Design a protein around this ligand. Structure first.
Ligand SMILES: CC(C)=CCC/C(C)=C/CC/C(C)=C\CC/C(C)=C/CSP(=O)(O)OP(=O)(O)O
Ligand SMILES: CC(C)=CCC/C(C)=C/CC/C(C)=C\CC/C(C)=C/CSP(=O)(O)OP(=O)(O)O
Ligand SMILES: [Mg+2]
Ligand SMILES: [Mg+2]
Lengths: 198, 329, 329, 198
């Protein structure tokens, strides 16, 4: 014990608010991917109480190297019943790429237009609330916070539909990220204010 | 001379720096989230209506900066659908401002025809007062054939409503027989947005301390330089704009590399999807086993061609439906 | 100095013309159908055995011409399987000539090692007298590691027998588990022919008035310059050879364009065949729907790699079986 | 009448011998293919009594433009019951390309090696007589005569297996070919002599 689990939970609970879904957008892809740094960020979100973490890079490297990343996450999660620990990370962690944004919205448009062709639905029956439930992340909330790492001032096609109200906090690099840096970005999100048009 | 673009040239220092940056890549299209009017009014101890009116003055001045910098297309977030949840007094104040600022546009016609200013107003415009719709429609109709510069006012607009409408138009095309559902593509959805006449913004600027996009051009700004600046919008300066352009120039080479590889990858995945479809119809009904006759090559060339003519005929109908306007009368 | 390559330099005119043509593309490998010996013997009123012996003299002289022209590999049709249907007296005469010409090769060893002459004898050699096989094997074994020039004697050879044997070797590899039947390819069949150590001929020359290939290098000469010359083989001159090379130079650019496009098209059709196979295993067992992960790209790279190692291991066994020679002992 | 049919038959019968199968190798492909000249050659072979005609070009143009060629053949065959006239040309005329040579021999090797894998056949059971019957032209004789047109001194991958004894006669072009030129090449083949190794 560890113990340490209680300390990290007390850190997440001390914030005015915590993200339920967080995105990690890596804008600079390193030659040999720094899975350990990525895995540390994921494990910190889980330890502080964030339910969903989406990992993203524009070239889909983490999606191509998915098992090396999950392995590093579960290795770092043991420190500070493997099947339960594995599925708990398969459900909380998603590794995303450009196809999960605009290509997925196009997939939802094809399927709905397939039902208009079969007289099962009318074009007018597609409001913004219906389209939202037809996306791949139908049963998972939109990202509250996005941590964007690296030198590029763009989301690079990450979940364009879902980031309508996401707070976007920028850090210059993930390469040796420390807990204090990660938690400082969490304090920024906790202090954010959303008036929802009013 | 006009009420929507201030008349004024760059000072010496602005002109000098402008000359320097114009030696590198310059943005063609800049999008603004004009935020912070009410905090600015509270800061100066004026009514919130004067904060918003100062906000229009800054717009006209900022379009003059862009025009002086050679940036000829500008998209601005003037009114969110979510803003309908403000008080009637405040909602009334913003509609009244738009009533006054539009129509002033109409008085200043011919001066728009002289400068070639095309004014487009994009959004779910049926939620606006009917008088405001007719007045918007008259301004848009009058500047339809102008092309020296472009200003897109997003009024009663959200990105999700825009995207949901683009799907509905594609579904309408299927319902009317203009399209097969397999014709839907990312590029087709591009041409069904309200912004379909303009290229995607090079820069998104949001003022005040907010680091979110607030349902603005989500589809269009997926590869745009995002610039968040603390300044309140009625206090925007030439140098805030300049700083944002410098940001764009710093990101330009990597952002264009990413933009190029996305398009290279999207087209490559579309080739695989159609290559497999050509084989599915070829594996069915006999076997291809070809070959010298280049059968797969012809079926693929014919596939995209018949796809191109369908979408081209679909869009001519979509513009025709969008051009049909009892409202300008 | 040797009995299989005459010693002699080019005359002035031969050297001069040679210098001129060597400014353009020169053949690397020339194949000869040495035909017309018996008509030549009848023409000079000598016995048919002297026609054939004059035929060997012309071979040695012609290899000297090639060597002087920088053409370092030569394939000759010395004895057809169909020639076994000649009379015993004539068949005996040709075997006796080969008995005498081989073994003379062995006496003239070290002189072969001095000039780097590699001698290969290709054909269904089991139909030859056993003594002739052992003597062939001794010559081939001795010159195995020489590489300054190459002469391939096709003895008891036909192209169909060679092609049928190449298939049998590939079938043997399947029977022994070295290959899957899907590993068979045009390039694999190339490496199972007797001629597998040499590139395909640039020129096929057939002498006397016959305009047919007579079951000679059908696979190998599919894109070779074909030259048919009326001259009887024992009367072949440097200028007959020169004329054939001029023919090659005239055809070279179009023949290489055709050769390049055939290989470009063969590889393209192999890509389609493997692309569809990767999808068949991907359409089965779930759906691909990929994608960014480049799954099809890895399955295709892994497909060819595992195919390459199988065929590479198959060929090492085929050469080992071909190297196993009790006959040289 | 026509009549003319009897005159052409008397021409073929007057030759010392006539090809049963003839190949037409076109080594130069024209921009707009000269189907009429090709169709005239095919019709002449049929009129003089040749049973099979194979049309060939290295780039597969005639195979890509097959119906335009058969149309021109049947048009020119009417001059000097369409279903009977159509199938009579589908059976006597084949339009070939490189894939019909080496790629077909490879196809036969794969199928036989597929039977060695299934223990249905032994490698030793593949003599040259067995391989010949496994090719695409199993029920059609090998070409006796090949007319090669154009400037290229190569068969360009045409039926390498089948042309082991084919007489190859060269004509500089097919572009305005006359009956006298075509029949002159037939006289050359009639005078050819094959001793079959003896
Ligand atoms: C369409 C229309 C209304 C007028 C037409 C003329 C026109 C395009 C004017 C420019 C649009 C202007 C001035 C303001 C945009 C409206 C608005 C509420 C912006 C957010 S500032 P907030 O109020 O949110 O300030 P804080 O964040 O400090 O609370
Ligand atoms: C392998 C061997 C036999 C000897 C080894 C030495 C060697 C390679 C000699 C060169 C081979 C020589 C001289 C002749 C090739 C044998 C032959 C019958 C050729 C056709 S000439 P045809 O007889 O057909 O004359 P026509 O057409 O006028 O009837
Ligand atoms: Mg605001
Ligand atoms: Mg002979």
């Amino acid at each position: 014990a560890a113990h340490h689990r209680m300390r990290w939970r007390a850190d997440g609970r001390s914030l005015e608010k915590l993200p339920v879904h967080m995105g990690l957008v890596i804008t600079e892809v390193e030659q040999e991917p720094s899975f350990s740094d990525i895995a540390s960020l994921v494990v910190w979100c889980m330890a502080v109480g964030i339910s969903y973490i989406s990992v993203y890079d524009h070239q889909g490297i983490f999606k191509r190297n998915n098992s090396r990343l999950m392995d590093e996450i579960l290795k770092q999660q043991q420190e500070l019943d493997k099947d339960d620990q594995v599925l708990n990370c398969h459900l909380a962690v998603k590794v995303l790429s450009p196809e999960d944004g605009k290509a997925d919205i196009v997939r939802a448009a094809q399927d709905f237009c397939q039902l208009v062709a079969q007289k099962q639905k009318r074009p007018t029956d597609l409001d913004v609330d219906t389209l939202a439930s037809l996306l791949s992340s139908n049963g998972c909330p939109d990202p509250d916070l996005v941590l964007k790492f690296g030198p590029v001032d763009s989301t690079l096609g990450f979940l364009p539909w879902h980031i309508r109200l996401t707070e976007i906090v920028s850090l210059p690099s993930h390469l040796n990220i420390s807990y204090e840096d990660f938690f400082s970005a969490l304090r920024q999100y906790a202090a954010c204010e959303q008036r929802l048009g009013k | 001379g006009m009420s929507w673009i201030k008349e004024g040239e760059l000072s010496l220092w602005e002109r000098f720096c402008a000359n320097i940056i114009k030696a590198g890549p310059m943005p063609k299209h800049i999008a603004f989230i004009m935020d912070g009017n009410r905090r600015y009014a509270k800061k100066c101890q004026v009514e919130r209506q004067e904060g918003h009116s100062q906000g229009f003055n800054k717009l006209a001045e900022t379009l003059r900066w862009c025009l002086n910098l050679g940036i000829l297309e500008v998209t601005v977030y003037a009114f969110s659908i979510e803003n309908f949840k403000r008080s009637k007094s405040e909602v009334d104040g913003l509609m009244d401002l738009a009533r006054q600022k539009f129509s002033r546009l109409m008085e200043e016609k011919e001066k728009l025809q002289k400068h070639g200013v095309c004014i487009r107003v994009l959004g779910d415009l049926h939620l606006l007062p009917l008088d405001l719709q007719e007045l918007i429609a008259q301004a848009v109709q009058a500047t339809k054939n102008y092309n020296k510069c472009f200003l897109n006012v997003c009024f009663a607009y959200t990105s999700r409503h825009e995207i949901s409408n683009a799907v509905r138009e594609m579904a309408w095309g299927v319902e009317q027989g203009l399209l097969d559902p397999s014709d839907i593509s990312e590029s087709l959805l591009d041409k069904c947005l309200y912004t379909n006449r303009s290229p995607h913004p090079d820069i998104l600027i949001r003022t005040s301390g907010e680091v979110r996009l607030s349902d603005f051009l989500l589809w269009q700004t997926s590869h745009s330089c995002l610039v968040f600046q603390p300044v309140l919008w009625p206090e925007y300066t030439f140098w805030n704009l300049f700083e944002a352009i410098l940001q764009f120039q710093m990101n330009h080479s990597v952002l264009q590399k990413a933009r190029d590889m996305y398009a290279e990858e999207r087209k490559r995945q579309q080739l695989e999807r159609d290559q497999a479809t050509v084989t599915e119809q070829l594996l069915r009904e006999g076997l291809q086993a070809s070959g010298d006759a280049q059968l797969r090559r012809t079926r693929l060339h014919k596939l995209s061609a018949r796809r191109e003519e369908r979408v081209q005929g679909f869009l001519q109908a979509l513009e025709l439906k969008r051009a049909d306007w009892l409202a300008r009368l």
